[PDB]
Amino acid sequence: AAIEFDEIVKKLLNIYINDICTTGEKRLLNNYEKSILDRIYKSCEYIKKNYELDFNSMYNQININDITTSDIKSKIIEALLIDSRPSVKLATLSFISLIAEKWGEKNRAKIMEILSNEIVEKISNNGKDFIDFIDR
């Protein structure tokens, strides 16, 4: 039967709903939360723009190599372990943003499992200084 469009529809629905969820999550935020989030976009895009060549070489070590996850987590978190500076956190976040930007045909879960749990906790630790580094 007509089954040559099944995988296409399957891929688009796992994109549509995820984009609707994001809209729903962004909908239940006040003007302050939206202001901070907007600063994150412009900040991370600025770094990925001016440090694209640096990120690219770091990416080439992380990506093309067929190694399991969490190896990547321990690979990246080391910067957050020694230095708990907001600048390092922002630099780390921008790099993850680059990875998620290049892994479009890969599973969304493969990127989120790197971000969530212990990693997002460390970036959030003393986040008041993190915001003041971005919002000023």
Binding site: I62, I76, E78, I82, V88, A91
Partner: peptide
Amino acid sequence: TKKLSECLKRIGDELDSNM
């Protein structure tokens, strides 16, 4: 052997260097 840790620190250093 190309430590991403060292690079991220170096990037973070150049970031807060500008004020």
